Tab-separated table of C-alpha atoms and ligand atoms in Angstrom:
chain	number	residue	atom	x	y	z
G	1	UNK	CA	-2.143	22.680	19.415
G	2	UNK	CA	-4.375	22.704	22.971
G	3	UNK	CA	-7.479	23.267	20.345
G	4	UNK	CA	-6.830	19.222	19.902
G	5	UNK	CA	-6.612	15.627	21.062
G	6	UNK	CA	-4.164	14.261	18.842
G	7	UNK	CA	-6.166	11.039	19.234
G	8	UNK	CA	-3.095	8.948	16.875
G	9	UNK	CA	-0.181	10.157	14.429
G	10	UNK	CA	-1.944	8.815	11.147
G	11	UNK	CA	1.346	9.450	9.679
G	12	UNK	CA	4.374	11.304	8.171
G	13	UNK	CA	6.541	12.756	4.957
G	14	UNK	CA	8.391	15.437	3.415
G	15	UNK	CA	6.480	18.092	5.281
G	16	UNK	CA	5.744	16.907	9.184
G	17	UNK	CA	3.665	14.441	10.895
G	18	UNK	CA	-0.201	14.135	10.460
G	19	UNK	CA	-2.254	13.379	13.607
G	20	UNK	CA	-5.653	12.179	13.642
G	21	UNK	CA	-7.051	14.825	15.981
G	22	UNK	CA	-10.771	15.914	17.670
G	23	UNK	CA	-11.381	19.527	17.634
G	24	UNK	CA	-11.802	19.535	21.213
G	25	UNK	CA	-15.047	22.275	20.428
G	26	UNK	CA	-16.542	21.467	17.401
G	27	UNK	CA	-15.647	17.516	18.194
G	28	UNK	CA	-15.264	17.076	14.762
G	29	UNK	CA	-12.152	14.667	13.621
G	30	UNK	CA	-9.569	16.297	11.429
G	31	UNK	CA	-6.202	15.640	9.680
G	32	UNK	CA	-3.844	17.853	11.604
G	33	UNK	CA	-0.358	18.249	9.937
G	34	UNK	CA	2.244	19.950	11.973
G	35	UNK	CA	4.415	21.536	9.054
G	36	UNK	CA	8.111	21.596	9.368
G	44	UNK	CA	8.457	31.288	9.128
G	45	UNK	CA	7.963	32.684	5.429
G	46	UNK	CA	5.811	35.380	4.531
G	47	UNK	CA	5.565	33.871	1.214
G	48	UNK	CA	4.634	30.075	2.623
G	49	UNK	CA	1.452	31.667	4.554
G	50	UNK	CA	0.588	33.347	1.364
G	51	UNK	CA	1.001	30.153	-1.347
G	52	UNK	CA	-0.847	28.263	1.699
G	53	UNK	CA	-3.879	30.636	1.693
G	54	UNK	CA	-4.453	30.288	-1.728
G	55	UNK	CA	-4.473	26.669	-1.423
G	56	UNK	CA	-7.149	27.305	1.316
G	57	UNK	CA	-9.558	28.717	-1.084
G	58	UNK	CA	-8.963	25.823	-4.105
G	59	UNK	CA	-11.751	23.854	-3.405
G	60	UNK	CA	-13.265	20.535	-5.654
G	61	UNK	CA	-14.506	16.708	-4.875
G	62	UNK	CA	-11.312	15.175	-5.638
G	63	UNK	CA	-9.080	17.430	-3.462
G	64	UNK	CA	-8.380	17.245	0.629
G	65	UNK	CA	-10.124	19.856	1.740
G	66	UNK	CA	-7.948	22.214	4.005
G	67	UNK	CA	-10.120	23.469	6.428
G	68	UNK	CA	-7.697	25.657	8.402
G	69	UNK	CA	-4.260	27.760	8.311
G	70	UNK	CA	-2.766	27.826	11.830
G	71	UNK	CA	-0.349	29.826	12.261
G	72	UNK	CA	0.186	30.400	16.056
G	73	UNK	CA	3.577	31.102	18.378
G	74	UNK	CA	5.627	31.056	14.527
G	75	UNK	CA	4.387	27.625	13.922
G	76	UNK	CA	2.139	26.324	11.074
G	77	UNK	CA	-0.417	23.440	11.404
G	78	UNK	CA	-2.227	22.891	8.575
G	79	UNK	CA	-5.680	21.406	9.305
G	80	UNK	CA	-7.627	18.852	7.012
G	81	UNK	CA	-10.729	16.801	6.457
G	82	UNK	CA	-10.342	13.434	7.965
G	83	UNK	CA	-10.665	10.322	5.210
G	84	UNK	CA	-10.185	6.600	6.599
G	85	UNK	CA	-8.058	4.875	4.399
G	86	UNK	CA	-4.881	5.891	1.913
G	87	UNK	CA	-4.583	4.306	-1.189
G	88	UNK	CA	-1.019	2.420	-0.315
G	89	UNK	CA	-3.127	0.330	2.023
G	90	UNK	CA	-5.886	-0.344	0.086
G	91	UNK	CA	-4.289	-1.624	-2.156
G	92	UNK	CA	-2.288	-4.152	-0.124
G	93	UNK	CA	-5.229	-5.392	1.306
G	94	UNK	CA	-6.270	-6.413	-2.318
G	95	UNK	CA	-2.779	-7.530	-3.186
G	96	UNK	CA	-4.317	-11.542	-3.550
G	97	UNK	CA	-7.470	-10.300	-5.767
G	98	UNK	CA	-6.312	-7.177	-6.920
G	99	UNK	CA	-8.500	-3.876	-7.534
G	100	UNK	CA	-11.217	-4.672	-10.083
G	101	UNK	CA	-10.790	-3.160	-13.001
G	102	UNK	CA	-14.521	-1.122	-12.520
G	103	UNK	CA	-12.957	0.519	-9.156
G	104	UNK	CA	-9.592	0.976	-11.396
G	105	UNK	CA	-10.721	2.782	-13.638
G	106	UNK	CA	-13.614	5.419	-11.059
G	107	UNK	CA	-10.168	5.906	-9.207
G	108	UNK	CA	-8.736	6.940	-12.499
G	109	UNK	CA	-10.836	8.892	-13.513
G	110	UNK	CA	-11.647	10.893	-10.153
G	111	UNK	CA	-7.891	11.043	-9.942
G	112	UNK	CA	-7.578	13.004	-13.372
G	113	UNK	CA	-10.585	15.404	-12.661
G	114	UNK	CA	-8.843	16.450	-9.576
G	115	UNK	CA	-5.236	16.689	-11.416
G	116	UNK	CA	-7.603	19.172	-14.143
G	117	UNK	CA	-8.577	21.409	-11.872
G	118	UNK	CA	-5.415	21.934	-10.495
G	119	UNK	CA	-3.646	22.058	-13.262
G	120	UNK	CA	-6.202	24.725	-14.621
G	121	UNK	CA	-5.030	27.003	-11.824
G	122	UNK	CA	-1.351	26.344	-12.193
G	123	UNK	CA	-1.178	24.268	-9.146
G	124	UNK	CA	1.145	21.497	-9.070
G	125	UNK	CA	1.657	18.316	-6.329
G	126	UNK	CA	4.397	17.236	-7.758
G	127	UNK	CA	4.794	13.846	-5.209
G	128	UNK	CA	2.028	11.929	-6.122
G	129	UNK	CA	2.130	8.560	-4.728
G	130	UNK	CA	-0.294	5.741	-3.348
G	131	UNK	CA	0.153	7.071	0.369
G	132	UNK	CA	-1.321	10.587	-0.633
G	133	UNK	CA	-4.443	9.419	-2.137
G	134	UNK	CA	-6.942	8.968	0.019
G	135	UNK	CA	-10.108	7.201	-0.276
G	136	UNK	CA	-13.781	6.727	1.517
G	137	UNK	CA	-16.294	3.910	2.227
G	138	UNK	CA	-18.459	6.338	-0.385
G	139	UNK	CA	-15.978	5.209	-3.529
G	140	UNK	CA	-14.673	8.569	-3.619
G	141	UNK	CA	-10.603	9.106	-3.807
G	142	UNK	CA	-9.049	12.097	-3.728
G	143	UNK	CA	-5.173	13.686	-3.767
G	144	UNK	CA	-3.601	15.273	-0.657
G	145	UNK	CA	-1.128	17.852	-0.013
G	146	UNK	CA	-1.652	19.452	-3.287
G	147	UNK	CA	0.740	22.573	-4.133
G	148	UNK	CA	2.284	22.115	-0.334
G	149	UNK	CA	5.409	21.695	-3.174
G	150	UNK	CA	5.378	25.165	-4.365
G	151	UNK	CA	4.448	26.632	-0.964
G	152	UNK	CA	7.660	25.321	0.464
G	164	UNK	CA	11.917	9.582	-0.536
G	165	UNK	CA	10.656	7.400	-2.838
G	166	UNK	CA	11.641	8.271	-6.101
G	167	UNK	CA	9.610	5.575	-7.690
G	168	UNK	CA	6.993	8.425	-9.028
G	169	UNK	CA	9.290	10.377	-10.330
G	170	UNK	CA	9.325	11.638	-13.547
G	171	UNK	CA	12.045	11.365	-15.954
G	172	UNK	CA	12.884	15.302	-16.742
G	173	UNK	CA	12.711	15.820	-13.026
G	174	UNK	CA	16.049	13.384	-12.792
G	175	UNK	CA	17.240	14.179	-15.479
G	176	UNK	CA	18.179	17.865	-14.075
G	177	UNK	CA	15.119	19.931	-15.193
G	178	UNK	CA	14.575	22.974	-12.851
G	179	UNK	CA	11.506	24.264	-14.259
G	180	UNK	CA	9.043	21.517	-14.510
G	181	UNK	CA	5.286	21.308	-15.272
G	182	UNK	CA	2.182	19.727	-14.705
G	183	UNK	CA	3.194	16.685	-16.855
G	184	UNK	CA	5.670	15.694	-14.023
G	185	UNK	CA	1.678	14.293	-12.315
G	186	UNK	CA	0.919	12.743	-15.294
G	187	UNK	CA	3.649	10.741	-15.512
G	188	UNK	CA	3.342	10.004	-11.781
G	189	UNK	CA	-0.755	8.997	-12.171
G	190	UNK	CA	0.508	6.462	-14.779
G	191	UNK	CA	2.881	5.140	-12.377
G	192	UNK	CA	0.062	4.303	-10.220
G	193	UNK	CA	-2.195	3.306	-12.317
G	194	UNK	CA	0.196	0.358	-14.145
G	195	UNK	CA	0.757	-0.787	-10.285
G	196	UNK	CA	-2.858	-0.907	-9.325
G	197	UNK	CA	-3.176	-3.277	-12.377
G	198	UNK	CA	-0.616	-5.495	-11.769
G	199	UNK	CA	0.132	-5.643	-8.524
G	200	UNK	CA	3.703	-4.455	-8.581
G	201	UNK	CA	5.264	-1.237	-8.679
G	202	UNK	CA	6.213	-0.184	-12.103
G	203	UNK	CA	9.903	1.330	-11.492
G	204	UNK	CA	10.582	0.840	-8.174
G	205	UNK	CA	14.116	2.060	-8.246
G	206	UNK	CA	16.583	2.798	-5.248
G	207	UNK	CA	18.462	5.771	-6.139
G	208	UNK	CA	17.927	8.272	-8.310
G	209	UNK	CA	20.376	6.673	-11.066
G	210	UNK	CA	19.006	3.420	-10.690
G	211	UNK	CA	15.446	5.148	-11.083
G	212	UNK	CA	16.662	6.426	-14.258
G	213	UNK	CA	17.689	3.187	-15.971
G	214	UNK	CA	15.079	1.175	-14.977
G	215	UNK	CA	12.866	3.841	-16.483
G	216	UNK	CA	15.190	3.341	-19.328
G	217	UNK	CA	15.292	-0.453	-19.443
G	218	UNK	CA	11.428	-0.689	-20.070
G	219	UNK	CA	10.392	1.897	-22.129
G	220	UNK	CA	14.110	2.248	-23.959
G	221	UNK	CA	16.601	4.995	-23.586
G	222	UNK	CA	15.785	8.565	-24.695
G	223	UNK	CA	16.986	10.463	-27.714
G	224	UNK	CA	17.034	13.409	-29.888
G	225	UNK	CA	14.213	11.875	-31.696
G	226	UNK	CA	11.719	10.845	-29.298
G	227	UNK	CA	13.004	13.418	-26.798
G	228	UNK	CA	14.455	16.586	-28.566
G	229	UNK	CA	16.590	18.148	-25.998
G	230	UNK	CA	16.875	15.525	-24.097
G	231	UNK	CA	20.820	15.641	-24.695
G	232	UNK	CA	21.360	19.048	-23.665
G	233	UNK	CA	19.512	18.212	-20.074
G	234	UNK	CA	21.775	19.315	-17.035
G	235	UNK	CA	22.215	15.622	-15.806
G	236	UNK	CA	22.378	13.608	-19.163
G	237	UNK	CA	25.637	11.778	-19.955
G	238	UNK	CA	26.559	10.576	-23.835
G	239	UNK	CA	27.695	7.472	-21.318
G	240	UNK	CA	24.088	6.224	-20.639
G	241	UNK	CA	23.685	2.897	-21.617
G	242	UNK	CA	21.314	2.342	-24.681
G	243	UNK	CA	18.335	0.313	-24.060
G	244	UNK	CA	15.546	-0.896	-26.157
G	245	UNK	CA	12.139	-0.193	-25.529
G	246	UNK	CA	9.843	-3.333	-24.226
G	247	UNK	CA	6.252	-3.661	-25.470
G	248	UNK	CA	3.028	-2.636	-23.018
G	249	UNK	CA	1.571	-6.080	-23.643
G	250	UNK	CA	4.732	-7.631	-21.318
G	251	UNK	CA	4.568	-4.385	-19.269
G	252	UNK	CA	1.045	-4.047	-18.290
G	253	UNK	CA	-0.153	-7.917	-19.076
G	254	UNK	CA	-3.747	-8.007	-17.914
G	255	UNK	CA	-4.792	-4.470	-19.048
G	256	UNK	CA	-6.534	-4.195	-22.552
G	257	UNK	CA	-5.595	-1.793	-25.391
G	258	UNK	CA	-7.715	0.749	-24.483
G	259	UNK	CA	-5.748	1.035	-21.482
G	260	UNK	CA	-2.681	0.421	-22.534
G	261	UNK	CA	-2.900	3.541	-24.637
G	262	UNK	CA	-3.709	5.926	-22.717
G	263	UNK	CA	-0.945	4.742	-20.195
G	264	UNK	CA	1.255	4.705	-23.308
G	265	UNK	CA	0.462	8.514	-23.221
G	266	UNK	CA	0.538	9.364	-20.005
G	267	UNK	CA	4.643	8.038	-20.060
G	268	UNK	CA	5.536	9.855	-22.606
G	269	UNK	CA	9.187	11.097	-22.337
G	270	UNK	CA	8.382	14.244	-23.808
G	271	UNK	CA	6.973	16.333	-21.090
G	272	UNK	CA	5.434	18.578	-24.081
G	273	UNK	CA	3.931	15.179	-25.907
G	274	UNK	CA	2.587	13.707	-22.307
G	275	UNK	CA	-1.087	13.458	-22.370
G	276	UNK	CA	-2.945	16.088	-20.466
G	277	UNK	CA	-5.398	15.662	-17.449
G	278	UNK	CA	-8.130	16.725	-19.645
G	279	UNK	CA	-7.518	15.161	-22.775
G	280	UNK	CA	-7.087	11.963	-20.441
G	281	UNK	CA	-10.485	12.209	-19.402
G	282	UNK	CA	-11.777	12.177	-23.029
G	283	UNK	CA	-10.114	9.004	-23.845
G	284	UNK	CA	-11.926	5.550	-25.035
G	285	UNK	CA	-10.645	3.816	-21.987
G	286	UNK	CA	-13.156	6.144	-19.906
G	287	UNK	CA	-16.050	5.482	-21.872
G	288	UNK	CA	-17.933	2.726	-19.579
G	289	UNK	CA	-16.812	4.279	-16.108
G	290	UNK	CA	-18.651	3.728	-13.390
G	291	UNK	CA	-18.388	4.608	-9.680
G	292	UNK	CA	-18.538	1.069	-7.265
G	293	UNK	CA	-18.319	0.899	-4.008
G	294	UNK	CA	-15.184	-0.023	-2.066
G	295	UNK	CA	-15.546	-2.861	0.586
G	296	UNK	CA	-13.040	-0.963	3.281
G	297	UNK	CA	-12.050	-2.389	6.271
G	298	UNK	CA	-11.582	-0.069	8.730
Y	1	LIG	C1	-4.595	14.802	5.278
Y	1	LIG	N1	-5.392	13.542	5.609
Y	1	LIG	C2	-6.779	13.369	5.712
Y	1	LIG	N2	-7.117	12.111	5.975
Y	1	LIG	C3	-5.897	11.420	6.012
Y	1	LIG	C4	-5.539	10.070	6.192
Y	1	LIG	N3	-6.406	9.082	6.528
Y	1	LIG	C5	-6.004	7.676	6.304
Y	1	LIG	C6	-5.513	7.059	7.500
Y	1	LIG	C7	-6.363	6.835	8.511
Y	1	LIG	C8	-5.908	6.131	9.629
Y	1	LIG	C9	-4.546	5.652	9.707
Y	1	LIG	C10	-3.672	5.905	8.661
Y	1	LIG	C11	-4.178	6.626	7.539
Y	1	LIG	N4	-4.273	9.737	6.051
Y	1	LIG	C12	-3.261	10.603	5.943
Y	1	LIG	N5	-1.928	10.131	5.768
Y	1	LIG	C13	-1.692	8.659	5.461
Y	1	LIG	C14	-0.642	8.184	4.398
Y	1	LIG	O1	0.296	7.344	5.117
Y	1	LIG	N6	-3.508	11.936	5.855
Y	1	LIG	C15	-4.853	12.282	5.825
């Protein structure tokens, strides 16, 4: 809009392109995300508006001007995504791991508490300050309105109406990558997403997974795989946290570990909040 100096296009995804923008009044710098007009859209938006909490993008404004939408934002320097490839030959310490965890679940809580969903977590929408805070972005945009490698399982396997354990799996996604340095199922198509899901933690059945059979996209032709053990999977990280990523990828949606429960685990009990040395 002529409100701003879109001083740099910070970036782009499912909904539009982000700019890095000065409010040419209050001169303050803002995340302004041109979305790509539905009564219903304005109204899931405004809602979103008013959801407010530390670990949560703040949106600071709803423009909707000339049937257009801009959605504006608080400003944060860095995204996760780059972060971490800037530690890529040291890797995250496990202290910073685990605060980004844990931040990460407290925000998923409160959402989750109000039956919002982001349902496209990845690294590139967490966002994170020289303070040591992290936080998620574009939460609920989803409802209001591609790397599949966050994806979770009953999502690809045809499910229409999904739940808040489709974040849960994708926070444990992250948060085996973060530890090792690699992406956990970095698959290129939605099939091959599916059976390299299946190829590390073993193919799903009626008894892990009851109704898993009877899913719109499951074929009696899947291959059957075995499941691999967490100590090959996630080498470095210790049993504490090996557990509770065990039960964050849970195939069962309904036997997935909740963002609160999460936050009550062992693996949480020596958290700490460290500083981030950014470069900006
Ligand atoms: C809504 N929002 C608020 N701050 C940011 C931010 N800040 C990080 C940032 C700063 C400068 C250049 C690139 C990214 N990055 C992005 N998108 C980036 C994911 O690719 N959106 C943001």
């Amino acid at each position: 809009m002529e409100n701003f100096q879109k001083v740099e296009k910070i970036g782009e995804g499912t909904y539009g392109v982000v700019y890095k923008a000065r409010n040419k009044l209050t001169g303050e710098v803002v995340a302004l995300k041109k979305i790509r007009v539905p009564s219903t859209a304005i109204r899931e938006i405004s809602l979103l508006k008013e959801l407010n909490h530390p670990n949560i993008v703040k949106l600071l404004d709803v423009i909707h001007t000339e049937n257009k939408l801009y959605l504006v934002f608080e400003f944060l320097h860095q995204d996760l995504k780059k972060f971490m490839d800037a530690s890529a030959l040291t890797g995250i310490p496990l202290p910073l791991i685990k605060s980004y965890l844990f931040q990460l679940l407290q925000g998923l809580a409160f959402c989750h508490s109000h039956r919002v969903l982001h349902r496209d977590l990845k690294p590139q929408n967490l966002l994170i300050n020289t303070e040591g805070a992290i936080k998620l972005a574009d939460f609920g945009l989803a409802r209001a309105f591609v790397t599949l490698w966050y994806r979770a399982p009953e999502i690809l396997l045809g499910c229409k109406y999904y739940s808040t354990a489709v974040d849960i799996w994708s926070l444990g996604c992250i948060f085996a990558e973060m530890v090792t340095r690699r992406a956990l199922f970095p698959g290129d198509s939605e099939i091959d997403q599916l059976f390299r899901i299946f190829r590390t933690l073993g193919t799903p059945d009626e008894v892990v997974w009851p109704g898993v059979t009877s899913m719109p996209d499951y074929k009696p032709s899947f291959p059957k795989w075995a499941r691999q053990d967490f100590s090959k999977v996630v080498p470095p990280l210790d049993e504490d946290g090996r557990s509770l990523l065990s039960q964050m990828l849970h195939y069962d949606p309904n036997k997935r570990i909740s963002a609160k429960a999460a936050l009550a685990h062992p693996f949480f009990q020596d958290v700490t909040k460290p500083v981030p040395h950014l470069r900006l």
